[PDB]
Amino acid sequence: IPHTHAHLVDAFQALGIRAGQALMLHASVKAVGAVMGGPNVILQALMDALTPDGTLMMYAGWQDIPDFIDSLPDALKAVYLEQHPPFDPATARAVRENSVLAEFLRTWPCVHRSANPEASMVAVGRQAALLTANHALDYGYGVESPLAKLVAIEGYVLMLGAPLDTITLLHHAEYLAKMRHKNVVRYPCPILRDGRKVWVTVEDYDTGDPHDDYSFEQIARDYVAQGGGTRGKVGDADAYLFAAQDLTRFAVQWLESRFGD
Amino acid sequence: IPHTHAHLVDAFQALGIRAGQALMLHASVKAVGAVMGGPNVILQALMDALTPDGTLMMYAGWQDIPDFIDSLPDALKAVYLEQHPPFDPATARAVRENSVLAEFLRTWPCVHRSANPEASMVAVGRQAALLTANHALDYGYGVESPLAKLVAIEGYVLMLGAPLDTITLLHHAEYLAKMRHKNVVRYPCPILRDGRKVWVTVEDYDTGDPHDDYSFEQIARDYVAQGGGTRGKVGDADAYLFAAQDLTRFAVQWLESRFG
Amino acid sequence: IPHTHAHLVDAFQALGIRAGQALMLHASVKAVGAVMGGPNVILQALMDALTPDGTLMMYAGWQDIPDFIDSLPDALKAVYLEQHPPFDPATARAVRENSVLAEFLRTWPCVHRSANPEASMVAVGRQAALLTANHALDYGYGVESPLAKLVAIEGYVLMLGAPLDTITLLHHAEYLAKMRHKNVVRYPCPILRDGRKVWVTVEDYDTGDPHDDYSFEQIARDYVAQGGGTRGKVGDADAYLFAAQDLTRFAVQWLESRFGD
Amino acid sequence: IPHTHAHLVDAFQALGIRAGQALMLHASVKAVGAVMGGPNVILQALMDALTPDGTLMMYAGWQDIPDFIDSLPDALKAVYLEQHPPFDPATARAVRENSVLAEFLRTWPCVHRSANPEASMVAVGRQAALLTANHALDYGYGVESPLAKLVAIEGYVLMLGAPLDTITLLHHAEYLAKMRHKNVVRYPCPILRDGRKVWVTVEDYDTGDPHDDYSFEQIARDYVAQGGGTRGKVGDADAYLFAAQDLTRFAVQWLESRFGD
């Protein structure tokens, strides 16, 4: 009754997932429904469809990032600066709202993790080191990011029962697009440097709210409506498979046509 | 008859300015009235009362600091990033609202200027290098600032027809005071590093608005009312002379009792 | 009698070269022996084993870099400052001792060349632009170098009859290693800036002599002795294939255990 | 016969010492000759000429710093790591070859001491806390040092029968100067961190030998020969009074003209 590994492998393949692809996954475990062996089998089935020559990536981030401390009373901020642990990539837990699957992949054998705390990506497979390498602290969805590299190697994005609003790649499209105005955020973050905690200022485009009157769901819905991507069932979940290069190109043109200067 | 150099020196001495003091000036040229020789003579008369063993300092800042570029359209901000000049302490003009006297002092012979663009101070005299040295870019009114040093050497603040709301030293009291919440700002600024332009992020407490329900004029008036400072006329101007250490102590206690 | 293209491809594959790898080559043409078609066929056979989704990189440097002029009399120095040509990446010849194969690759179609004159790297393939981008003038074997990026994307080093003392990647290990003594040098170099010749000063760790009592031969031989890398014949040449990340990690530990904190 | 407090005060004033100056002293007690009350009176007379508005600073260092332990056998090194006391600024004795006057000033009432063990400075007076604050452990004669601050506040250096080779400020000139070769060292040191002994590694330019073919004696003699500073007798001692800013500028130009870019 629960979905089997073999059936999930074939369901992923039916969508168009092929040996050797680099793929970034957004998922809802509940949407897929009961799997025989639990969410590990979702990851393993996807890895098997990709084969060891492919690569699987997820957005992990950092569940406990203390980027809000300026909003606290001064005396409480002082305690955070002294007592909050730094981002340690070996232990920093994935953002829970990024799916438990991101935390499962973060702790998978042979995983690689990128160094930007807020934008941290985890990946397993042939190009996992490449995708996660040299992730700049500032503008973490920009040109020196795993999203840029995913576009460059013509990777894919799989939404597995995940809302279309959660496509992290579209923050890279926001970065690229010549828009009339984008909101810049600067926030403190503790990191490790020579094995010691250092608080640094991170600069980035706001990724919590859009820069103008749009949503990622709207961009993705328009992409699908004009023939973009493939769609199909995986377990109980509605799934969408997008080519990163074409989706990014479409999204940049979409933003610039509506909100450019 | 326009006010003379001698009459200004004498009025400065009558108010309590003494040889060897370190003094930070806030002024209105218009409030002083016509001076024989112009605003140079205000500066020179004050320097003469201080003698070369004293020191005179003003808050210059940078009139053209482009700290607002994040609010501009992205395409315009890109042009600023490419074309706006960096803070060059040799040429960066003083904020006009800090008085033309601050720009006059900034271009005075033997002046020293501190390196923080937004908070830049200029000084002439025996301790001018000391006061302006190693002015940190972040928290420019804090521990690594000319204001901290002015307090440490028990200097003075002279208000020469300037409103009591303009006492820059009270931003140092804000920095020191343990208050429930202070607003932190981070803003971009172009500077010179190894002779090349570099854009850096500056972090500071907000100095454009108070951190709570107060004004500097309110603090200063309360200080005067409880016997703080000396008052007198210099030219046509109402003048106030404050000890930096006592005013800072008072303002920190004032802030902490109300907002701590 | 001469080695054929097909036999060289087979030998590279037997050694462990795989499609998609990013590979840095050190070679001796003489050690390989006569090849049917000459040294071009060595490069093409290696590129074929790597496929277009792989990358081949070599250290080119600049045969005629005038980094020695501070030692000359002022009058001769003035002539160098006036008359020596700048580093032009389109024409600057590779160091002859880096093998003629480095000069052959530098002039190969679709090559990318990194901008640091003394440390210039040349590469052909899918990650060639990535590896050669933004190569800082200072500390050219350091954090901003193609060697750092080769480690970060988990590339490989192939020794094709080249002595183990010539592994340029070990200068990156010297840069990373925390050691009791380092020599820092500053030297002059003419470059092109806005189409004009400009003399700049480059700061780097000394790469002409070791920083302490060791040799690269010593480190690499120890690496092999503990099971590092794979070995085999390619043509007449003894070949070694090393993982860049594992060799660098080993060499940093080797240096730090003897001269470190 | 023994020099009196009053006659030292007069001699310091005749040399050019003035109220309010920040002054770094290098001294020989024997060169001054017998003082009525002993070396305390040298320090007190100098403080009196400076007044409490002035500041007197000396290089104390740490007589017992175990910065040499990497050269010992592993077994003896092990005992040092276990048993050597940490740098405690309250008790760490001044280097004996820095003059007993440095230890006398280190134990003077109201003294402030900078935190860098090897480069520790002690000071008494109005800018004593300023000069000694935030003395970084790495590059202790560099930008984050009391010597940098002495230059910035336009202080002075007084040589009181001390050899001209002993001007510690010239290590700051070495740090600033752009030079063809520098030696960088890393050495161990035990310090206090949250009241517990911790061993750290300090990185600095070598200050035990020059970076090139020069001595501080040469630089200082050349400075004096071109009119730098003021000279006079204090007690039996030849004294020199130098402006820290002018001497540092001269020394940096001297080094860069001979060994610079």
Ligand SMILES: CC(C)(COP(=O)(O)OP(=O)(O)OC[C@H]1O[C@@H](n2cnc3c(N)ncnc32)[C@H](O)[C@@H]1OP(=O)(O)O)[C@@H](O)C(=O)NCCC(=O)NCCS
């Ligand atoms: C928010 C969102 C993750 C919620 O989806 P979800 O299916 O409810 O949550 P998850 O995918 O984390 O799965 C949670 C379920 O995994 C199940 N599960 C199975 N084994 C588990 C295990 N060892 N440990 C924990 N949970 C386990 C549990 O049933 C758990 O549900 P429960 O806590 O209610 O018992 C989803 O709507 C979504 O948005 N996904 C895309 C997220 C994304 O990629 N965001 C990018 C940034 S915008």
Ligand SMILES: CC(C)(COP(=O)(O)OP(=O)(O)OC[C@H]1O[C@@H](n2cnc3c(N)ncnc32)[C@H](O)[C@@H]1OP(=O)(O)O)[C@@H](O)C(=O)NCCC(=O)NCCS
């Ligand atoms: C805002 C404030 C400066 C305005 O006072 P003000 O007397 O009108 O202005 P200034 O002191 O700059 O003097 C300007 C006058 O100097 C005169 N002046 C004389 N010689 C001059 C010269 N060579 N060049 C320019 N102006 C000259 C001019 O008459 C000029 O007035 P005008 O342009 O209207 O003709 C004053 O109210 C104030 O706040 N002073 C304190 C400022 C301060 O210290 N702020 C700290 C940060 S909060």
Ligand SMILES: CC(C)(COP(=O)(O)OP(=O)(O)OC[C@H]1O[C@@H](n2cnc3c(N)ncnc32)[C@H](O)[C@@H]1OP(=O)(O)O)[C@@H](O)C(=O)NCCC(=O)NCCS
């Ligand atoms: C120094 C070293 C290159 C010498 O090896 P080598 O085989 O003698 O020299 P090369 O690899 O340059 O091959 C030269 C041969 O290529 C041959 N060749 C074939 N076609 C050629 C052509 N069109 N043009 C020139 N030479 C050609 C020639 O026989 C030439 O030898 P020759 O000039 O004596 O006739 C080798 O010992 C070595 O150290 N390799 C590693 C180099 C390195 O990577 N260094 C990194 C910095 S330490």
Ligand SMILES: CC(C)(COP(=O)(O)OP(=O)(O)OC[C@H]1O[C@@H](n2cnc3c(N)ncnc32)[C@H](O)[C@@H]1OP(=O)(O)O)[C@@H](O)C(=O)NCCC(=O)NCCS
């Ligand atoms: C090395 C140098 C200090 C030797 O000078 P010195 O006059 O022989 O030594 P000191 O200045 O330490 O004075 C020591 C004398 O102080 C006298 N003294 C007086 N009271 C004393 C007391 N309570 N306790 C100890 N000594 C006392 C003693 O005569 C002692 O000499 P002694 O042990 O032979 O009896 C001197 O040549 C020098 O180089 N000074 C500059 C040092 C410097 O600043 N170095 C910076 C780093 S390069």
Ligand SMILES: NC[C@H]1O[C@H](O[C@H]2[C@H](O[C@@H]3O[C@H](CO)[C@@H](O)[C@H]3O)[C@@H](O)[C@H](N)C[C@@H]2N)[C@H](N)[C@@H](O)[C@@H]1O
């Ligand atoms: N792609 C649109 C999404 O925006 C928000 O999630 C973003 C997230 O926003 C955070 O959400 C927290 C509060 O929910 C804040 O701390 C924010 O920083 C941001 O910090 C990440 N860098 C990227 C995430 N995409 C929304 N939470 C999500 O529901 C929505 O689908």
Ligand SMILES: NC[C@H]1O[C@H](O[C@H]2[C@H](O[C@@H]3O[C@H](CO)[C@@H](O)[C@H]3O)[C@@H](O)[C@H](N)C[C@@H]2N)[C@H](N)[C@@H](O)[C@@H]1O
């Ligand atoms: N706290 C009282 C004072 O605050 C403001 O001046 C501050 C000033 O704030 C600017 O004032 C402008 C409003 O005209 C804004 O651009 C602000 O950025 C800030 O740039 C300086 N760092 C410190 C100045 N004290 C007031 N201008 C001044 O009139 C008043 O006396």
Ligand SMILES: NC[C@H]1O[C@H](O[C@H]2[C@H](O[C@@H]3O[C@H](CO)[C@@H](O)[C@H]3O)[C@@H](O)[C@H](N)C[C@@H]2N)[C@H](N)[C@@H](O)[C@@H]1O
């Ligand atoms: N570390 C091992 C290697 O070091 C030297 O080659 C280096 C080379 O050194 C030059 O060669 C001369 C002899 O050392 C120096 O004077 C420099 O000009 C240097 O310029 C490059 N930056 C890197 C090269 N690896 C050796 N020449 C080389 O044979 C040896 O394999």
Ligand SMILES: NC[C@H]1O[C@H](O[C@H]2[C@H](O[C@@H]3O[C@H](CO)[C@@H](O)[C@H]3O)[C@@H](O)[C@H](N)C[C@@H]2N)[C@H](N)[C@@H](O)[C@@H]1O
């Ligand atoms: N500035 C020149 C001076 O160098 C030496 O003293 C230096 C001292 O050098 C040590 O002294 C040992 C032998 O000289 C070295 O091994 C170092 O550890 C060094 O540790 C300090 N950081 C700075 C001192 N200046 C000389 N002791 C001194 O006589 C000479 O005049």
